[PDB]
Inverse folding.
């Protein structure tokens, strides 16, 4: 829902959100 202005550009912490 929320914007991914930096959520999409970021490919590091993204795969770390779950872990």
């Amino acid at each position: 829902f929320l914007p991914k202005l930096f959520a999409k550009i970021t490919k590091k912490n993204m795969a770390h959100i779950r872990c």
About this structure: The chain is about 0% helix and 0% strand.
